[PDB]
Protein backbone atom coordinates (compact mmCIF):
# COMPACT_ATOMS: atom_id res chain seq x y z
CA UNK A 1 0.00 0.00 0.00
CA UNK A 2 1.61 3.21 -1.23
CA UNK A 3 -0.02 6.21 0.42
CA UNK A 4 1.00 9.74 -0.51
CA UNK A 5 2.77 11.75 2.15
CA UNK A 6 1.51 15.32 2.38
CA UNK A 7 4.71 17.34 2.59
CA UNK A 8 3.12 20.81 2.46
CA UNK A 9 3.50 23.19 5.40
CA UNK A 10 -0.20 24.00 5.23
CA UNK A 11 -1.01 20.26 5.16
CA UNK A 12 -3.53 20.84 2.37
CA UNK A 13 -2.50 17.76 0.36
CA UNK A 14 -1.23 20.08 -2.38
CA UNK A 15 2.01 18.11 -2.73
CA UNK A 16 1.95 14.34 -2.18
CA UNK A 17 5.07 12.18 -2.21
CA UNK A 18 5.66 8.44 -2.60
CA UNK A 19 9.13 6.92 -2.47
CA UNK A 20 9.73 4.38 -5.25
CA UNK A 21 13.42 3.72 -4.67
CA UNK A 22 15.13 4.42 -1.39
CA UNK A 23 18.24 6.56 -1.63
CA UNK A 24 21.57 6.46 0.17
CA UNK A 25 21.90 7.24 3.86
CA UNK A 26 19.84 9.93 5.55
CA UNK A 27 21.20 13.21 4.16
CA UNK A 28 18.91 15.53 2.22
CA UNK A 29 19.78 18.72 0.33
CA UNK A 30 19.73 22.09 2.10
CA UNK A 31 18.35 25.39 0.86
CA UNK A 32 20.94 26.85 -1.50
CA UNK A 33 22.41 23.49 -2.52
CA UNK A 34 22.94 22.87 -6.21
CA UNK A 35 20.80 19.85 -7.02
CA UNK A 36 20.89 17.52 -10.02
CA UNK A 37 17.77 15.59 -10.98
CA UNK A 38 16.28 13.45 -13.71
CA UNK A 39 12.52 13.68 -14.06
CA UNK A 40 9.40 13.02 -16.05
CA UNK A 41 6.12 14.94 -15.76
CA UNK A 42 2.67 13.77 -16.90
CA UNK A 43 -0.68 15.52 -17.09
CA UNK A 44 -3.83 13.86 -15.79
CA UNK A 45 -4.33 12.28 -19.24
CA UNK A 46 -1.09 10.32 -18.74
CA UNK A 47 0.80 12.17 -21.48
CA UNK A 48 4.27 13.53 -20.76
CA UNK A 49 4.51 17.29 -20.67
CA UNK A 50 8.20 17.29 -19.71
CA UNK A 51 11.22 15.01 -19.28
CA UNK A 52 14.94 15.52 -18.75
CA UNK A 53 15.59 12.09 -20.24
CA UNK A 54 13.87 13.15 -23.45
CA UNK A 55 16.47 15.96 -23.64
CA UNK A 56 19.22 13.51 -22.63
CA UNK A 57 20.48 15.83 -19.91
CA UNK A 58 20.07 16.07 -16.13
CA UNK A 59 18.33 19.19 -14.85
CA UNK A 60 20.20 21.44 -12.42
CA UNK A 61 18.88 24.08 -10.05
CA UNK A 62 19.56 25.79 -6.72
CA UNK A 63 17.20 24.47 -4.05
CA UNK A 64 14.79 26.85 -2.35
CA UNK A 65 15.30 29.76 -4.72
CA UNK A 66 12.10 29.62 -6.76
CA UNK A 67 13.92 28.30 -9.85
CA UNK A 68 11.39 25.47 -9.90
CA UNK A 69 7.74 25.18 -8.90
CA UNK A 70 7.01 25.31 -5.20
CA UNK A 71 6.22 21.59 -5.12
CA UNK A 72 9.80 20.85 -6.18
CA UNK A 73 11.45 23.26 -3.75
CA UNK A 74 9.42 21.49 -1.03
CA UNK A 75 9.76 17.97 -2.38
CA UNK A 76 13.37 17.72 -3.46
CA UNK A 77 14.35 19.01 -0.01
CA UNK A 78 12.96 15.73 1.38
CA UNK A 79 14.88 13.42 -0.98
CA UNK A 80 18.04 11.39 -0.38
CA UNK A 81 20.74 10.98 -3.01
CA UNK A 82 19.70 8.17 -5.32
CA UNK A 83 16.06 8.38 -4.28
CA UNK A 84 13.29 8.08 -6.86
CA UNK A 85 9.88 9.40 -5.86
CA UNK A 86 6.59 10.27 -7.44
CA UNK A 87 5.27 13.74 -6.62
CA UNK A 88 1.64 14.80 -7.17
CA UNK A 89 1.41 18.58 -7.44
CA UNK A 90 -1.82 20.58 -7.31
CA UNK A 91 -1.71 23.71 -9.49
CA UNK A 92 -1.34 26.05 -6.49
CA UNK A 93 2.08 24.43 -5.93
CA UNK A 94 2.88 24.31 -9.65
CA UNK A 95 1.94 26.71 -12.48
CA UNK A 96 -1.44 27.83 -11.12
CA UNK A 97 -3.88 29.72 -13.30
CA UNK A 98 -1.15 30.91 -15.67
CA UNK A 99 -0.03 27.45 -16.71
CA UNK A 100 3.13 27.18 -18.76
CA UNK A 101 1.63 27.12 -22.20
CA UNK A 102 1.18 25.42 -24.51
CA UNK A 103 2.57 22.34 -22.78
CA UNK A 104 1.10 22.85 -19.31
CA UNK A 105 -2.52 24.00 -19.17
CA UNK A 106 -3.92 26.51 -16.72
CA UNK A 107 -5.07 24.95 -13.43
CA UNK A 108 -3.39 21.60 -14.13
CA UNK A 109 -2.37 19.01 -11.58
CA UNK A 110 1.12 17.71 -12.42
CA UNK A 111 2.36 14.18 -11.81
CA UNK A 112 6.15 13.86 -11.57
CA UNK A 113 8.68 11.05 -11.32
CA UNK A 114 11.91 12.47 -9.86
CA UNK A 115 15.36 10.98 -9.28
CA UNK A 116 17.75 12.97 -7.10
CA UNK A 117 21.11 12.31 -8.75
CA UNK A 118 23.33 14.47 -6.62
CA UNK A 119 23.61 17.67 -4.67
CA UNK A 120 26.37 19.89 -3.36
CA UNK A 121 26.77 23.05 -1.27
CA UNK A 122 26.61 26.50 -2.82
From Swiss-Prot:
It is found in: Cytoplasm; Nucleus. Induction: By androgen. Acetylation impairs ability to promote interaction between Akt/AKT1 and PHLPP1. Deacetylation by SIRT7 promotes interaction between Akt/AKT1 and PHLPP1, leading to suppress Akt/AKT1 activation. Ubiquitinated, leading to degradation in a proteasome-dependent manner. Deubiquitinated by USP49, leading to stabilization. Residues 24-112 form the PPIase FKBP-type domain. The modification N6-acetyllysine is found at residue 10. Widely expressed, enriched in testis compared to other tissues. Disulfide bonds: none annotated. It comes from the Eukaryota. Part of a heteromultimeric cytoplasmic complex with HSP90AA1, HSPA1A/HSPA1B and steroid receptors. Upon ligand binding dissociates from the complex and FKBP4 takes its place. Interacts with functionally mature heterooligomeric progesterone receptor complexes along with HSP90 and TEBP. Interacts with NR3C1. Interacts with Akt/AKT1 and PHLPP1; enhancing dephosphorylation and subsequent activation of Akt/AKT1. Interacts with IFI44L; this interaction modulates the kinase activity of IKBKB and IKBKE. Interacts with IKBKB and IKBKE. Immunophilin protein with PPIase and co-chaperone activities. Component of unligated steroid receptors heterocomplexes through interaction with heat-shock protein 90 (HSP90). Plays a role in the intracellular trafficking of heterooligomeric forms of steroid hormone receptors maintaining the complex into the cytoplasm when unliganded. Acts as a regulator of Akt/AKT1 activity by promoting the interaction between Akt/AKT1 and PHLPP1, thereby enhancing dephosphorylation and subsequent activation of Akt/AKT1. This is Peptidyl-prolyl cis-trans isomerase FKBP5. It comes from Homo sapiens (Human). The chain holds residues 20 to 140 of 457 of the full protein.
Amino acid sequence: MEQGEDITSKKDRGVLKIVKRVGNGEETPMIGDKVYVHYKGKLSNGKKFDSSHDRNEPFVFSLGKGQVIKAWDIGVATMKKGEICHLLCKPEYAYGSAGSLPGIPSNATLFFEIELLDFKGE
